[PDB]
Structure 1
Amino acid sequence: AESHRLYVKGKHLSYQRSKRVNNPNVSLIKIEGVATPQDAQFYLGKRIAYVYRASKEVRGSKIRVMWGKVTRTHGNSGVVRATFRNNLPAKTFGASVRIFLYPSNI
């Protein structure tokens, strides 16, 4: 009743990039409550949805969602790589993202 959340909120840090080159096809996502790669291993394969409000109404709603998946871990701070059907605008750096529990294995 008070809360209807069924996802783990996260933050989009930036694309997989070198010192001077970036690869938008891969996005780095920070998951709250994750600190080590072992913890992030559970989130692999989970669907990632980015929810934002659009000025125009297209399908009877003002919310447009971009879907994605968790590919593999990144670094030692729990960062996990993610790939979406369409890459993020690159303006969402630090924006909130939603990670669902499906497809679940537990």
Structure 2
Amino acid sequence: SGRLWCKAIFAGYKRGLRNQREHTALLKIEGVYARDETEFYLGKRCAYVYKAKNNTVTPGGKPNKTRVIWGKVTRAHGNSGMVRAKFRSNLPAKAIGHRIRVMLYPSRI
């Protein structure tokens, strides 16, 4: 057993300087510091995973306090390896600076 996902950070939303598009999140992936290296991560699943007070059903398990918002990488952002991600719901601003799991599927290798 061991980790099966890459470590990312929720850097912020899509934006100009004074307008914010919350439907797109900018993700920073550990070890990906150029745009030509982001190609592996396009289309891969992304998960904002967190905990709440109330229990919720777990697929393949019993209810617990873990919750997840799923998404996926949609395209690269910039020159230094940032990617754009989209989630089933806009990410909460409290998630900025926190871990975003990037899964190794859908596999293309």
Which of 52, 69, 73 aligns to 1:70? It is 73
Gaps of 5+ in 1: none
Identity of aligned residues (%): 52
Tell me whether 1:61 sits opposite 2:64 in the alignment: yes
Provide the residue aligned with 2:90 in structure 1.
87
1:27 correspondence with 2:30: no
Distance 2:80 2:34 in 1: 6
Task: Give the C-alpha shift of residue 58 in structure 1.
Answer: 2.3
SS in 2 for 1:62: strand
Cα deviations across residues 58-89 of structure 1 (Å, max 9, x unaligned)? 22111001100100000111100000010101
> By percentage of residues, which structure has more strand?
2
- Letter aligned with residue 46 of structure 2: I
Q: Which runs of 4+ in 1 moved over 2 A?
A: none
Query: What is the SS of the residue equivalent to 2:53?
Result: coil
Give the TM-score normalised by the residue count of structure 2: 0.92
CA RMSD, Structure 1 to Structure 2 (Å): 0.8
Question: CA-to-partner distance for each residue in 1:46-67, whole Å, 9 max, x for gaps?
Answer: 0001111111112211100110
Show structure 2 runs of 5+ residues with no match: 58-62
Which residue in 2 is equivalent to 1:10? 8
Cα distance, 1:19 vs. partner?
A: 1.0
TM-score with structure 1 setting the length: 0.95
